[PDB]
């Protein structure tokens, strides 16, 4: 019943692929909510103009 979110930001200079390095992810937030999640989506900010 706990939703855990961990996050990390890292500057990158490589063009496309993931970098060859190591970096841990410190905890960001914990939420005490009980939902039996099975699937998820994503949100896009398209330029409506």
């Amino acid at each position: 019943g706990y939703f855990k979110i961990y996050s990390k930001h890292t500057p990158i200079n490589l063009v496309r692929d993931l970098p060859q390095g190591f970096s841990a992810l410190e905890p960001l937030v914990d939420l005490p909510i009980g939902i039996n999640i099975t699937r998820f989506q994503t949100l896009l900010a398209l330029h409506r103009s």
């Binding site: 019943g1 005490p32 009980g34």
Partner: protein, 49 residues
């Protein structure tokens, strides 16, 4: 209702609110205040941090 100032007990309005809880079904989030004491140092004591 027939609420009137001249009415005695048993007829005057009374404000009543009932409070209800749950019993160990979801992660608890409404709990009583937690007490605290003064912090001592350099003395053999017991602690509840």
């Amino acid at each position: 209702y027939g609420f009137q100032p001249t009415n005695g007990v048993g007829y005057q309005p009374y404000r009543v609110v009932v409070l209800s809880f749950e019993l160990l079904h979801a992660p608890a989030t409404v709990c009583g205040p937690k007490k605290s004491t003064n912090l001592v140092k350099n003395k053999c004591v017991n602690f509840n941090f």
